[PDB]
Amino acid sequence: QGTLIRVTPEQPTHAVCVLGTLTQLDICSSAPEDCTSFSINASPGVVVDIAHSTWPLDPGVEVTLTMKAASGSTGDQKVQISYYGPKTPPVKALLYLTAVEISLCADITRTGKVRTWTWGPCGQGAILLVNCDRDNLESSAMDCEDDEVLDSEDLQDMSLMTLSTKTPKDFFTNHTLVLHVARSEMDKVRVFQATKCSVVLGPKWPSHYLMVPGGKHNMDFYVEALAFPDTDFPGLITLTISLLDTSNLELPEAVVFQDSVVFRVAPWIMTPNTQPPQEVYACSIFENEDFLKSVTTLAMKAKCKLTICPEEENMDDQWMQDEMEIGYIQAPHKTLPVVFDSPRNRGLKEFPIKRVMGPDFGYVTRGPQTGGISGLDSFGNLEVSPPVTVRGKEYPLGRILFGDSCYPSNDSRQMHQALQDFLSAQQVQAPVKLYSDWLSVGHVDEFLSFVPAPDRKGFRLLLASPRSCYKLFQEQQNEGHGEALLFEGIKKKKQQKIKNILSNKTLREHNSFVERCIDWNRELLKRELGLAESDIIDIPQLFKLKEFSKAEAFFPNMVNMLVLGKHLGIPKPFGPVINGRCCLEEKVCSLLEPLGLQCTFINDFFTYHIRHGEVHCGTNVRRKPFSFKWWNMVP
Amino acid sequence: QGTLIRVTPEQPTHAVCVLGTLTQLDICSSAPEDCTSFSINASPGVVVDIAHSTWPLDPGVEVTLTMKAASGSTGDQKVQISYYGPKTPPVKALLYLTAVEISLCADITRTGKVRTWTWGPCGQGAILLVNCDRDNLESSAMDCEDDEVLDSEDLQDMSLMTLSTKTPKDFFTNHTLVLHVARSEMDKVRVFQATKCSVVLGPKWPSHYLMVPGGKHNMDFYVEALAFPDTDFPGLITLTISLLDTSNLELPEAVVFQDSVVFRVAPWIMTPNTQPPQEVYACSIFENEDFLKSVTTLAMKAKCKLTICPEEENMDDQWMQDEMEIGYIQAPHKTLPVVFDSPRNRGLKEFPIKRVMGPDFGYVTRGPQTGGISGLDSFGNLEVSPPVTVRGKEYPLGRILFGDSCYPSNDSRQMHQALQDFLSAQQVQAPVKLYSDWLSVGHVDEFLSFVPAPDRKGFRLLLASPRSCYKLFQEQQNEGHGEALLFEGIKKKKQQKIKNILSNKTLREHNSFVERCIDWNRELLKRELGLAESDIIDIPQLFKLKEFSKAEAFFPNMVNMLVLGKHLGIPKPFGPVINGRCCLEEKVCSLLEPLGLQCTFINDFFTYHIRHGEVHCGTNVRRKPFSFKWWNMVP
Ligand SMILES: [Ca+2]
Ligand SMILES: [Ca+2]
Ligand SMILES: [Ca+2]
Ligand SMILES: [Ca+2]
Ligand SMILES: [Ca+2]
Ligand SMILES: [Ca+2]
Ligand SMILES: [Ca+2]
Ligand SMILES: [Ca+2]
Ligand SMILES: [Ca+2]
Ligand SMILES: [Ca+2]
């Protein structure tokens, strides 16, 4: 701020001046009469400035004091104001000042070293992590649920704030420092004093009297956040230091100086398929051994850790895609992966809590944990694009994509509002709603996927395409193969010839309708991600409508693939074999191999496909966080 | 949006094109082989554009159709694409198009006539009022609490949205229009169809099938909001129209076109003392008759309606300042005053509900209505500045000011968070927290007030000032009047001489502490309102500390005044009479009369002052809304 000090010939005034502060003088209000003019003299540590030699006694004339160093003792710098007139001997008013340093410091330039918070690479303000992992090897709670620092590792997650004082040795005889946080925000932050660590602010306490010695002192605090940005929390936390005059034992304490630091809490951020893979997840269940070896091979080729959830934990839930999504949070001092656990709560319910969350692995959940849910809350319906720039505006972390109905009806489904709100409140991947409710299961992974590409924007959008499959199949009939059988290679499955598929008119009608649902999203994506046709590749894929006229995959849904860098784990369509090969596999390879991609076709037919999901639905991936720092975006 | 239409020689395609939409053609995906090139011919109502005569068959070549007018009948515009090659006779693919107009329209230029919402005088987007008055002369509920329009006057409060269609006469045989709102927002808006009015959207229904005839039609809707901007509602409401293809009786309906309008809900806005007065409020209680005549005179001189709450309604609550604050809401079509009713809930509890709310007078309340409250929730602690510009940034409606503690402790008080959040969420008067908890009662009206001024910025900030009173009194002792008595003119009150007041050292100590509390706010206001010293006038005023060392007025608190334009109703200090006059009254007049202000001193001593409030605390004012339109600010 800056104080105004009123001087009088009546008696000398005494005041504290905090370094970095504007200190001003009122000289006219008690200037004795007789008097026209004034002079100022001050000791060498005080700098005096006068805008608007000696001056007239005009109240508009501005006098300011700044002090070059902290005082060694109380009142060791002096100012003397001299009032005089035509025939009037000078009269002196004295001001004894004590200068002190009070710097509340934090990593506001976002470099790991120690007003307002602003975004961008020219912005300012410190970052704070939600301490939502479990460095504590003992219990089952996120580190930030108690009021203690139980491991020293835990401190690496926290943000350092330092209070730095320089005062006379007896200064805190008559002054006291208090650290505080608004009641509004105290349930979202916890601050520890490092003396060993003890809580000074938190849900329970919004202010704390500090024990500070006179002289030079540095006091380190460690800060953790306890809540992510959300509908009712924009994500900023302000911590303030107040200096109080406690000189007078009869009067209340009086505020002399306040300063603040403002932290932003780090958002939860997702990683698209174009980010290098690091660890792969799946379930082992009855009779799925061979699916797992293909997944194991592919992981091995992509240099990835593998992690499997045995049927004793699964409780027969094979849909490892659906219960969780692995993102990260990121600060200059620390980055760590964090699982967003879906309120789905089927047999994999425990897996995120028990097996994923842990040392340097965070946890978050949203939405009601018993009931009130739908299929659209499963995380095969939560995806994210690669980085894109859309008509000037940069999304350097991509944009989250999730499925919805085209309008709300009695029969429509949506992702739960609490999830939607959470995702929007993370800001930095500005979500886009797509249309997926036309699918029986209802998930955006059922019709799109993204893959790396060495040119253009770095990727291609893959979309399922009936059109592409009708064209492929018609082509084959044209060159003589109308007799060729879909489902060749499968036992207890009624083969169908290309010619009967092309001539089946209901099937063609169903796929026309699907074609419209997908086209609609195509244009939506083109608009909201700034894609051109040359960004998109259509994957040949047939559907059929079933209960409530909702769409299912006619043969294994190849777009529902596992993307591990250049290694793809694509569901095996079992298409008509022509010239030694499945023409579907051949058509796909012809579209993906020129991008450097390797397609491995995995058999998931009686294991996954007949339970209405594929390879992507049965797996999950943790991937490398972006290198671009989220705080440098201007959302 | 814009659709992409896939053409084939296989058979002709049929499609709808909504006017104002980008329609594009895919010509290559089913271009038969043999073929190198293509030509397009179309009927006269279709405009064809080709970037990147006749053209090669390059998939990157872009073909777009726009249509100049609505179709008179289905498929009445045609496009014919001709594929040909070196030795290949042309083959034609046909496209039959039907053009329609679907305009969902609203007052987006904010002029009373009928994407996104943007602020400022070059921004765009319609405005919507919370229908929080009671035009219904019967009951006691805000108009917007039921699902009906009961008076035709009620419609003046609502926003008009018009759907405007032009189609073939049979168009809605195979298509249907649905109007909707997100489930997220359905509890905040209610939409009526004007056929008489009936509800089509609201808390109960998020989508409605519209009954629309073919041909030209215009359908009027009337919209009301039901919630103000708040912590969990940024204030935007989007209403969407979707066009569905219902051609196929076997398949689900298919979305063809969506469009939206976005409304912003009007914030609750306060009016500073510098806005011309219109109506004045007070209580009649036992033995306060003479206070009321002075208030009556002053109202009369300011051309103001007067309104009094008799003791049968008061229930002995005389503090008309404290239970309510009169603001307004404003849209291009309608502006009306709205009372913000404090959760104080003492004897005036009913007054806002029963007597203020009514035809063209709105109502709002926040915070818990039983308990959990403090003195700081009373609306003498809610004020607003005149318009100001602060280091470039304009606050054309001023900034709300309300009192707080300097930091939260076990003994500190604050205005309830729900009030604070509500006020911030109104955006346009960006609240400032001041320090008022040092006062026994705790209200910013106890130390500041604002008054019109014919120069400078249009106003002066008045602040209570012990310094000013010590200087006045010392001056008088200097010119011979140390014997003069404070409380001259009062019976059952112990007079005190100027000389004993100047020499009372505890009193001087108490006022030094008060002086610091006020100085602290002085600088705060100077910073947050961009004030200079020449904006501020100090009013001579003494205090004393009492229970819990909290401050009370030593003599009647003159800053706690009724400002009715140039007519001021200032508490009568009963200061020492010197040369025929109260020297306090004289000092005040000397400071205010040069600004054109007229000071009337009202006796409130045994009626108000001894119950720890003054004239401002015993009254309230409705004032003229600003002329500057809130939506033109860029907050
Ligand atoms: Ca802990
Ligand atoms: Ca930790
Ligand atoms: Ca779960
Ligand atoms: Ca950790
Ligand atoms: Ca997912
Ligand atoms: Ca109504
Ligand atoms: Ca109304
Ligand atoms: Ca009330
Ligand atoms: Ca009305
Ligand atoms: Ca007020």
PDB file of N, CA, C and O and ligand atoms in Angstrom, chain B residues 131 133-135 143 153-158 334-336 358-361, ligand 9:
ATOM      1  N   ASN B 131     -37.331 -12.142 -13.310  1.00  0.00           N
ATOM      2  CA  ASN B 131     -38.713 -11.676 -13.162  1.00  0.00           C
ATOM      3  C   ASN B 131     -39.093 -11.800 -11.689  1.00  0.00           C
ATOM      4  O   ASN B 131     -39.927 -12.598 -11.297  1.00  0.00           O
ATOM      5  N   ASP B 133     -40.068  -9.158  -9.585  1.00  0.00           N
ATOM      6  CA  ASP B 133     -41.144  -8.306  -9.050  1.00  0.00           C
ATOM      7  C   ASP B 133     -42.469  -9.108  -8.866  1.00  0.00           C
ATOM      8  O   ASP B 133     -42.482 -10.363  -8.947  1.00  0.00           O
ATOM      9  N   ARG B 134     -43.556  -8.372  -8.600  1.00  0.00           N
ATOM     10  CA  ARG B 134     -44.911  -8.945  -8.379  1.00  0.00           C
ATOM     11  C   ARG B 134     -45.943  -8.001  -8.995  1.00  0.00           C
ATOM     12  O   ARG B 134     -46.577  -7.196  -8.305  1.00  0.00           O
ATOM     13  N   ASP B 135     -46.011  -8.056 -10.327  1.00  0.00           N
ATOM     14  CA  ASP B 135     -47.105  -7.453 -11.095  1.00  0.00           C
ATOM     15  C   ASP B 135     -48.513  -8.050 -10.743  1.00  0.00           C
ATOM     16  O   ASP B 135     -49.532  -7.365 -10.899  1.00  0.00           O
ATOM     17  N   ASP B 143     -43.416 -13.009  -9.528  1.00  0.00           N
ATOM     18  CA  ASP B 143     -44.009 -13.533 -10.771  1.00  0.00           C
ATOM     19  C   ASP B 143     -43.431 -14.853 -11.302  1.00  0.00           C
ATOM     20  O   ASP B 143     -44.200 -15.688 -11.808  1.00  0.00           O
ATOM     21  N   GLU B 153     -49.274  -7.362 -18.348  1.00  0.00           N
ATOM     22  CA  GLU B 153     -48.202  -6.478 -17.905  1.00  0.00           C
ATOM     23  C   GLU B 153     -46.895  -7.256 -17.643  1.00  0.00           C
ATOM     24  O   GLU B 153     -45.832  -6.788 -18.006  1.00  0.00           O
ATOM     25  N   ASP B 154     -47.011  -8.423 -17.013  1.00  0.00           N
ATOM     26  CA  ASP B 154     -45.900  -9.319 -16.729  1.00  0.00           C
ATOM     27  C   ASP B 154     -45.001  -9.493 -17.954  1.00  0.00           C
ATOM     28  O   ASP B 154     -43.761  -9.455 -17.813  1.00  0.00           O
ATOM     29  N   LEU B 155     -45.593  -9.596 -19.143  1.00  0.00           N
ATOM     30  CA  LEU B 155     -44.790  -9.734 -20.368  1.00  0.00           C
ATOM     31  C   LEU B 155     -43.803  -8.626 -20.712  1.00  0.00           C
ATOM     32  O   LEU B 155     -42.879  -8.830 -21.504  1.00  0.00           O
ATOM     33  N   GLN B 156     -44.027  -7.441 -20.184  1.00  0.00           N
ATOM     34  CA  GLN B 156     -43.106  -6.329 -20.382  1.00  0.00           C
ATOM     35  C   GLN B 156     -41.779  -6.603 -19.695  1.00  0.00           C
ATOM     36  O   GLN B 156     -40.757  -6.085 -20.080  1.00  0.00           O
ATOM     37  N   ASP B 157     -41.807  -7.407 -18.653  1.00  0.00           N
ATOM     38  CA  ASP B 157     -40.590  -7.785 -17.972  1.00  0.00           C
ATOM     39  C   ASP B 157     -39.766  -8.801 -18.765  1.00  0.00           C
ATOM     40  O   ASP B 157     -38.578  -8.907 -18.538  1.00  0.00           O
ATOM     41  N   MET B 158     -40.395  -9.523 -19.703  1.00  0.00           N
ATOM     42  CA  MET B 158     -39.779 -10.695 -20.320  1.00  0.00           C
ATOM     43  C   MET B 158     -39.113 -10.307 -21.613  1.00  0.00           C
ATOM     44  O   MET B 158     -39.354  -9.244 -22.115  1.00  0.00           O
ATOM     45  N   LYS B 334     -36.748  -2.615 -20.514  1.00  0.00           N
ATOM     46  CA  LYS B 334     -37.334  -2.540 -19.175  1.00  0.00           C
ATOM     47  C   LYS B 334     -36.246  -2.387 -18.095  1.00  0.00           C
ATOM     48  O   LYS B 334     -35.230  -3.086 -18.115  1.00  0.00           O
ATOM     49  N   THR B 335     -36.480  -1.456 -17.187  1.00  0.00           N
ATOM     50  CA  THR B 335     -35.606  -1.191 -16.072  1.00  0.00           C
ATOM     51  C   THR B 335     -36.511  -1.148 -14.880  1.00  0.00           C
ATOM     52  O   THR B 335     -37.552  -0.569 -14.956  1.00  0.00           O
ATOM     53  N   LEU B 336     -36.132  -1.759 -13.776  1.00  0.00           N
ATOM     54  CA  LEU B 336     -36.944  -1.635 -12.604  1.00  0.00           C
ATOM     55  C   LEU B 336     -36.121  -1.766 -11.322  1.00  0.00           C
ATOM     56  O   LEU B 336     -35.091  -2.385 -11.323  1.00  0.00           O
ATOM     57  N   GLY B 358     -43.324  -5.314  -5.352  1.00  0.00           N
ATOM     58  CA  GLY B 358     -44.655  -5.179  -5.936  1.00  0.00           C
ATOM     59  C   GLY B 358     -44.600  -4.891  -7.421  1.00  0.00           C
ATOM     60  O   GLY B 358     -43.624  -5.186  -8.078  1.00  0.00           O
ATOM     61  N   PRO B 359     -45.651  -4.274  -7.953  1.00  0.00           N
ATOM     62  CA  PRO B 359     -45.629  -3.998  -9.385  1.00  0.00           C
ATOM     63  C   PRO B 359     -44.440  -3.151  -9.750  1.00  0.00           C
ATOM     64  O   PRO B 359     -44.320  -2.039  -9.272  1.00  0.00           O
ATOM     65  N   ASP B 360     -43.575  -3.674 -10.599  1.00  0.00           N
ATOM     66  CA  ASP B 360     -42.389  -2.940 -11.058  1.00  0.00           C
ATOM     67  C   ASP B 360     -41.375  -2.629  -9.940  1.00  0.00           C
ATOM     68  O   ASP B 360     -40.586  -1.711 -10.054  1.00  0.00           O
ATOM     69  N   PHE B 361     -41.401  -3.444  -8.890  1.00  0.00           N
ATOM     70  CA  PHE B 361     -40.435  -3.397  -7.856  1.00  0.00           C
ATOM     71  C   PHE B 361     -40.000  -4.820  -7.491  1.00  0.00           C
ATOM     72  O   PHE B 361     -40.753  -5.604  -6.924  1.00  0.00           O
TER      73      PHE B 361
HETATM   74 CA    CA C   9     -43.163  -5.507 -14.125  1.00  0.00          CA
END
